[PDB]
Amino acid sequence: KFPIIANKRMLEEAQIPKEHNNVALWVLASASCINYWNFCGPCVNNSEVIKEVYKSRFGRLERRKEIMWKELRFTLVDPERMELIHALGGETWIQEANTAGISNVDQRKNDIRAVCRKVCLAANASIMNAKSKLVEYIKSTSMRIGETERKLEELILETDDVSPEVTLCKSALGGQLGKTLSFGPMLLKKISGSGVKVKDTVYIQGVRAVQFEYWSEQEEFYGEYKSATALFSRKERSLEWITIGGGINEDRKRLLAMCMIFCRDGDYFKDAPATITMADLSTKLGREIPYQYVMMNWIQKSEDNLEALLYSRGIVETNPGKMGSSMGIDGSKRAIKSLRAVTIQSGKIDMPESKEKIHLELSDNLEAFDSSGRIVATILDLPSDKKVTFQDVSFQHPDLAVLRDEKTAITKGYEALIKRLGTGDNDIPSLIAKKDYLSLYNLPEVKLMAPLIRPNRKGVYSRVARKLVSTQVTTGHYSLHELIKVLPFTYFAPKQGMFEGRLFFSNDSFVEPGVNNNVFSWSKADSSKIYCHGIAIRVPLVVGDEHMDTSLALLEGFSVCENDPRAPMVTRQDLIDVGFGQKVRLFVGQGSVRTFKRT
Amino acid sequence: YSRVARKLVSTQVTTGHYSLHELIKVLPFTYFAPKQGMFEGRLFFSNDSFVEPGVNNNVFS
Amino acid sequence: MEINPYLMFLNNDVTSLISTTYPYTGPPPMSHGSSTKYTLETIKRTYDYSRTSVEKTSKVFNIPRRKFCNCLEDKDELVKPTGNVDISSLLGLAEMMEKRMGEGFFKHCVMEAETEILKMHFSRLTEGRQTYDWTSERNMPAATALQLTVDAIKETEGPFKGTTMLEYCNKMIEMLDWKEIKFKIDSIKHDEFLIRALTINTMAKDGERGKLQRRAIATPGMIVRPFSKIVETVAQKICEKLKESGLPVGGNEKKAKLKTTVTSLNARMNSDQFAVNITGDNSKWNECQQPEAYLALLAYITKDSSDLMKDLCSVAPVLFCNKFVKLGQGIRLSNKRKTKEVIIKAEKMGKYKNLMREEYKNLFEPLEKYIQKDVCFLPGGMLMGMFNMLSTVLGVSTLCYMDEELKAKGCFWTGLQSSDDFVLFAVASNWSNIHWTIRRFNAVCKLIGINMSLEKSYGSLPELFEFTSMFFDGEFVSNLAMELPAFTTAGVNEGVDFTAAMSIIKTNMINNSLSPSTALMALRICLQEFRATYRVHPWDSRVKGGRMKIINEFIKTIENKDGLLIADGGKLMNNISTLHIPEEVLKFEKMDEQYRNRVFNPKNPFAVVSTHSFR
Secondary structure (H helix, E strand, O other): OOEEEOOOHHHHOOOOOOOOOOOOOOOEEOOHHHHHHHHOOOOOOOHHHHHHHOHHHHHHHHHHHOOEOOOEEEOOOOOOOOOOHHHHEOOOEEEOOEOOOOOOOHHHHHHHHHHHHHHHHHOOOOOOOHHHHHHHHHHOEEEOOOOOOEEOOOHHHHOOOOOHHHHHHHHHHOOOOOOOOOEOOEEOOEEEEOOOEEEEEEOOOOOOOEEEEEEOOEEEEOOEEOOEEOEEEEEOOEEEEEEEOOOOHHHHHHHHHHHHHHHOOOHHHOOOOHHHHOOOOOEOOOOEOOHHHHHHHHHHHOHHHHHHHHHHOOEEEOOOOOHHHOOOOOOOOOOOEEEOOOOEOOOOOOOOOOOOOOOOEOOOOOOOEOOOOOOOOOOOOOOOOOOOOOOOEEEOOOOOOOOOOHHHHHHHHHHHHHHHOOOOOOOHHHHHHHOOOHHHHHOHHHHHHHHHEOOOOHHHHHHHHHHHHHHHHHHOOOOHHHHHHHHHHOOOOOOOOOOOOOEEEOOOOEEOOOOOOOOOEOOOOOOOEEEEOOEEEEOOOOOOOOOOOOOOOOOOOEEEOOOOOOOOEOOOOHHHHOOOOOOEEEEEEOOEEEEEEEO | OHHHHHHHHHHHHHHOOOOHHHHHHHHHHOOOOOOOOOOOOOEEOOOOOEEOOOOOOOOOO | OOOOOOHHHOOOOOOOOHHHHOOOOOOOOOOOOOOHHHHHHHHHHHHHHOOOOOOOOOOOOOOOOOOOOOOOOOOOOOOOOOOOOOHHHHHHHHHHHHHHHOOOHHHHHHHHHHHHHHOOOHHHHHOOOOEEOOOOOOEEOHHHHHHHHHHHHHHHHOOOOOOOHHHHHHHHHHHHHOOOEEEOOEEEOHHHHHHHHOEEOOEOOOOOOOOOOOOOEOOOOOOOHHHHHHHHHHHHHHHHHOOOOOOOOOOHHHHHHHHHHHHHHHHHOOOOOEEEEEEOEOOOOOOOOOHHHHHHHHHHHHOOOOHHHHHHOOOHHHHHHOEEEEOOOOOEOOOOOOOOOOEOOOOOHHHOOOOOOHHHHOOOHHHHOOEOOOEEEEOOOOOOOOOHHHHHHHHHHHHOOOOHHHHHHOOEEEEEEOOOEEEEEEEEOOOOHHHHHHHHHHHHHHOOOOOOOOOOOEEEOOOOEEEOOEEEOOOOOEOOOOOOOOOOOOOOOHHHHHHHHHHHHHHHHHOOOOOHHHHHHHHHHHHHHHHHHHOOOEOOOOOOOHHHHHHHHOOOOOOOHHHOOOOOEOOOOOOHHHOOOOHHHHHOOOOOHHHHHHHOOOOOOOOOOOOOOOO
16 A cells, blocks of 8 residues: 655655545555655756766767668678667668768669669550650659769769669660670679570470570570579580589579579470469560560569479489588588589689670660670569659659559648638638538539549538538538548538448548548647648648637537536437437547537 | 337238237337438437337336 | 468478467466475486485484495496486596696686685675575575574674675584574574575476476575585686587577587588587486586686685585475375365374375385485485586586597587587588497486487487577577566566666567567567556546546646656657667656656655655
């Protein structure tokens, strides 16, 4: 009851009465005594002393406040910070938050490569105007790159960063290349040998057939996948030998599979899996796809496909003296059993460099060709479309961005509703003072916002909204906020049904009167503002009382009244069977209860 | 309410398959004139006390 | 339709889903008790794992003394546990380890432990899980029994003015020879006080993850406490320099040790050789550790050092060579219909042995010899969770073995060992010599009582092994040691419990046992636990509690609701990047100056020192 001990003179000198409001508080004492002491008690000024004594903690807080938070990224492994290393970088993720150092170049590289990917994808919407739409997008895209407002017609050239998108977009500019290749996300390069194209067939389901191409001669290459080097030689649709330099379990598997596809080694180039027969669609919406990229995509779906591909490659038992340089199905460095024609080692294979620049030729499918075919890049080797917010950018030509969503549609509808006020005749306040609400049910803006409404039960929403509107207009007691909130629904014939307390749009979102929400919120002491997803909007007018009267914006045929606990709690349905002079409590929100009375 | 009550009564009386414990309950509402509206399912008096036609409650069991 | 919540283990790993196999951390509702029958079974299995039959009546009690050390017999069926130790091999392994690390290694460590002890205050002994009072004959925290002991010393032969560990120990020694001792009031003689000091009680508490095998965790008194602390300090100073010692700390450092070991292995073993792993699990790590071998080892250690430490380190061992064990609650009787039920203590079970059942009888007669009044004169074993550092040192000694018989075959081993769990890494160039190496290792381990389980110890190829719930793999090292606080059991203060929980969560995140979203959920859970504990809620809530009536009445006089304290209708403002920062430091500049000064008023009747304490 009074476990907490205390002092006596310290209590009386503060004049702490027991049972202040039936709370004893107490030598011994309760805990509520602390609340009574900190809410109504003596006042000191010892802030400076506290800060000085707890200087270490408050300096830590200051340092924390002295941070410039940066982005984060999911990845792996190939003092003042120790206080926060727990929140700075784990093992699967990491945040690049910095303290004092600034250098904006690699972020600029990421931005430029992302936007290049974006634009090159956008150009994949026709069959004939590929290069034209591409170049026009480029010329219509400017950026505040770093600190300089530059255009995207010179950065692609001035930059030196190999990539499928950089190359795919620069070839159209007759720009210089570096003899590098891109088969999917992997990076390849030629070392020696040469050959010519040759065609072959492959079955699907055991009946159909499809043609692919390859090379028949010997040729050596240099593969390089994330955290993994390699070297190998392809000969007649099959992989002869291969060696890997830098070891990571996951990377070695994907790199090996990609090099195998590049060599088309394996039986799945004779027949196909039973999963492909489910589709047999080596085609886009309206375009064609080779077999290699189909196989790759089939790999990306699940690692079981990768394991199957690797089993297709012969597996054998390792012999002595080779464990140190053997491999396993899961990339294991050494194992009693390994795969045929493999060699693991340590140290990344030093990559060669080609100092011979060239220019390629784009095709209908934007595929570039330097000579003897030997595709260097394409859209097929790109990721799927990934929406990302772009800043410091200007994109003027159509297809720049859809920039059309239900959220933005609603935002614009509400902006139009707000501007319509216009502090003039033939606008909201004139109709209010005139008590002509019917015209409100015919404005253009509500007609533009109507399509955003849930169609199945729009009649009841319109009924309720018209009820509220008329009841707030006729009497003259109203609140512009809730009105504008519900107006978009006062545009279809009213009908009978069951209402619950929320008005749903077509995007599954909703709005509710007498409450606030992310889509629409407002509050007093800032009534000149209306938040929309946090976007504060302004009112072309000023009001101090036009909103203060919300007694009719909560329910339809009721009005708020003084609080009364005796009144019984109810729901929205039984309301119909109430009478007059009969108060009722009811929830108006989350843990928000209010009393109401008919009329 | 009056409408509904009269309805039930006719339905029970025309055939002969009635339950005397329901007429004695709903009759007090048949005095007035029918009208149109949505019947939620309960019949309220002027004192916030209702009776339901078919299930027993504190007011009529 | 059917269900099988294991099919997700087919197309996925195990390091990602293994956590779903064990329940969430917390107090075990099993109520693992410490009954008399369990204790007697333990004592029996102890005396049995001793494969000898020799004895020697003492002179201080007139009682036999099963001397199970350096007297191995009953070689048959030796795969089962053993406790008979060989001193020669033990000292040989110690010598190997010394040679490896260095000559003046043990000396440096013992010197460090000494100097650390010198400036130590005996008051440290107040920091302990629990003990057993030798006056009230119960279990309590260390501070209570310490006060009891000091006030008894005061009442009997004046106060203890040492204020240091060494004077405390010498006072205990002297008290061993006192004939009469007093305490609040009653006194006792020499023999009874000796016994009480050498008494032990079985505690039921066993709280941890993994396995709660600590049914009868020991609970010693206070006399032996400081010497045990000294020995543990030395063993710790030793385990730090050892690479294969994951006991003193865990997590980041533990993973570092793992990967260092693995990489050194990969860079050492020749191309022809191929490695393997074993998931060892030592069984009966408490019923096969003998304090006599520990004594000989400590002697060999301090051989070249101050005789002070030589004698000091030789205290706790002998105190454990003679340790009376308090038998739990005695058996009960009953008639057929069970309408009547008699209750008897342990000391008198030897008086009604003719009635108890056989299984309970055959487990009681052979031990009646060693009983004195109600306890059993256990001359060895090691039940407490003590000397864990020392046992770990012995294990590391086991792993640092190497000879020429192996070298000739081109094989060796290495690994890591916790208290009673280890991981081995064998090396060879044939699928058979591996078996020979494993058998050699098991033999050298059994020579000194360290056994191994067969139904709980497995193996596999190099990539996949498990250690202290940290299921290691080629990658994706997954931990499972997620700890949590508990307010109801430990209500230290309102102010300090939330900050402590935040620090705990931060730590768990460091050890990678927790992730951002998981940490946030745990935080929002601990906040609610705290509130419900101290019966506090925010102001927005429509609560009617006793603190809440006054808090709701005094809410309208302030605007900085954000600055309010959680203990006073407050709301949270801390997050992941603000854990080390207490909420107070985070709301100081925000609290309405009135409330601020009203809280930080040192002129009140009572981590940032608040006006929120529960003395």
